[PDB]
Design a protein around this ligand. Structure first.
Ligand SMILES: NC(=O)[C@@H](O)Cc1ccccc1
Lengths: 40, 148
């Protein structure tokens, strides 16, 4: 399996970016396999 | 070896993720490559450090990214979706509250091949990578940052 990389851009902030998405506060736990899960 | 954001491709060809080149080190998420060596042109990039729990891996040297979300300001996801030009999505992170402290989280849901895309602060520094998270139907990604 040929896994390879291709440059796609500079790392820059863009003043004209689209703005979206909410800001939820969630209780979570992180297990040994790197998996997040919700906690109550 | 040039600084930038890169697609991670596999062979037709498919985009399996994204990563960040900085200071000669390639940074991406463990679940994208599972640590496999990567081709860059005629060169080869070998893994250097990886951790399943953090879901991170670095190639050619140690993890270099150390900026962190300030807990108040909007950030930008520099999303590199399969088949699409790199594009910036600005958002105010929410919070993953954990027994070990709080982690910024972005409530943005892009295709899986976007995993490893960098999240940036206003100064253009990478505060973490996109693509390890939880579902609440809506996916929410931790802002996953390593240790330098
Ligand atoms: N895929 C491979 O052959 C190894 O390099 C994977 C590896 C293991 C632990 C930390 C980083 C990378």
């Amino acid at each position: 399996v040929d896994m390879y990389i291709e440059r796609a851009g500079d790392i820059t902030w863009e003043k004209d970016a689209e703005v979206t998405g909410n800001s939820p506060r969630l209780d979570v736990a992180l297990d040994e396999s790197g998996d997040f899960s919700l906690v109550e | 070896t040039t600084d930038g954001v890169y697609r991670v491709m596999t062979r037709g060809s498919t985009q399996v993720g994204v990563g960040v080149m900085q200071e000669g080190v390639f940074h991406t998420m463990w679940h994208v490559t599972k640590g496999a060596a990567l081709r860059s042109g005629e060169g080869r990039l070998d893994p250097y450090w990886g951790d399943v729990k953090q879901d991170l891996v670095s190639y050619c040297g140690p993890w270099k990214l150390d900026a962190a979300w300030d807990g108040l300001s909007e950030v930008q996801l520099l999303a590199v979706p399969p088949g699409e030009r790199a594009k910036n999505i600005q958002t105010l992170p929410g919070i993953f509250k954990t027994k070990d402290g709080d982690i910024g989280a972005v409530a943005l849901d892009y295709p899986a091949g976007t995993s490893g895309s960098p999240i940036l602060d206003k100064s253009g520094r990478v505060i973490g990578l996109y693509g390890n998270g939880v579902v609440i139907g809506s996916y929410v990604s931790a802002i996953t940052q390593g240790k330098r």
